[PDB]
Curated annotation (Swiss-Prot):
One of its GO terms (molecular function) is aspartic-type endopeptidase activity. Disulfide bonds join 255-290. Its EC number is 3.4.23.22. This is Endothiapepsin. It comes from the Eukaryota. Residues 17-328 form the Peptidase A1 domain. The keyword NADP does not apply. The gene is EAPA. The active site is at residues 35, 199. It comes from Cryphonectria parasitica. The chain holds residues 90 to 419 of 419 of the full protein.
Length: 330
């Protein structure tokens, strides 16, 4: 089997991407944030505290003839940005882009933090990291990909995110028309439960490439590119007036600037992030200070190749027995 679904930015800055997911019988379609940095499929639901729902589409298990309470199971998750959610669990039929998993754990939110409530366009998350990070207790549950894996033509999914435009998540096949040149594959460590890999270096603009190992995660659920302070300082030093602002919470730059590109290494290959991808616009409406799309990972504890980086590439998440990651230009 295969699946293919379009993913759409939630706003004009590509702050996140939503992908329609069919849950239950008859189908209830919710728009989920596919997140390669976590491993829970959770949704706003009929059980979510009413005051914490503000415009989201909810899953109502009582209206699904295939929903079954997973008796005793609860979940609770905290994300890197400080957001959180928790609740109980149902199993139900879940389909993405024509690919159907029966018995998928669907984690029903009883509580969500304010950032989720405030995001009316995101109806929940679909985790695509390794199932070892799944938070369901006392019986840990498998991700949608893990459940689908054996049925897929090939044990892979791909992320092809758009810049200010829709893109595609495919399951079970590699669309050879969706990228240019060849795919360069690189080793993955699953020791922390992430799609963790080591970039071979970077360049700023038309500058020379610096060979240096940068361990990080491929994370579709993180907006920006978070890299070591040394790397980030070298980038922003090439933008007149750019500075790190403690008050704003990162690097800002004059909105009048033309940003240089940023290149990262994948083995001997190179992925170029155009300067425009690094512009996240005014810090507040009408401001002439703009927020940067490359930020320091210092104090996160991990480098994160988020959407800013991933959307510059066609990315293969290879879930073979020895998982790997592939990157191609597009």
């Amino acid at each position: 089997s295969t699946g293919s679904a379009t993913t759409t930015p939630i706003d004009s800055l590509d702050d996140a991407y939503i992908t329609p997911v069919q849950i239950g019988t008859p189908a209830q379609t919710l728009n989920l944030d596919f997140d390669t940095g976590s491993s829970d499929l959770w949704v706003f639901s009929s059980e979510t505290t009413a005051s914490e729902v503000d415009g989201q589409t909810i899953y109502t298990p009582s209206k699904s003839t295939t929903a079954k309470l997973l008796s005793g199971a609860t979940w609770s998750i905290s994300y890197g940005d400080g957001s959180s959610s928790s609740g109980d669990v149902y199993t139900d039929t879940v389909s993405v882009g024509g690919l159907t998993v029966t018995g998928q754990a669907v984690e029903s939110a009883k509580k969500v933090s304010s950032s989720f409530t405030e995001d009316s366009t995101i109806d929940g998350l679909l985790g695509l990291a390794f199932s070892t990070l799944n938070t369901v207790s006392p019986t840990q549950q498998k991700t949608f990909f893990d459940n689908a894996k054996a049925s897929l033509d090939s044990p892979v999914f791909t992320a092809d995110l758009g810049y200010h435009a829709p893109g595609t998540y495919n399951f079970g096949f590699i669309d050879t028309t969706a990228y240019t040149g060849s795919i360069t594959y690189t080793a993955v460590s699953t020791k922390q439960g992430f799609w963790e890999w080591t970039s071979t270096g970077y360049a700023v603009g038309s500058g020379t490439f610096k060979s240096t190992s940068i361990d990080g995660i491929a994370d579709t659920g993180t907006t920006l590119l978070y890299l070591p302070a040394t790397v980030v300082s070298a980038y922003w030093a090439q933008v007149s007036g750019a500075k790190s602002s403690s008050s704003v919470g990162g690097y800002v730059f004059p909105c009048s600037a033309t940003l240089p590109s940023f290149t990262f290494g994948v083995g001997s290959a190179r992925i170029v992030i155009p300067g425009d991808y690094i512009d996240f616009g005014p810090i507040s409406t009408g401001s002439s200070s703009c927020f940067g799309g490359i930020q320091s990972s210092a104090g996160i504890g991990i480098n994160i190749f988020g959407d800013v980086a991933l959307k510059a590439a066609f990315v293969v998440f290879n879930g073979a027995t020895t998982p790997t990651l592939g990157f191609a230009s597009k």
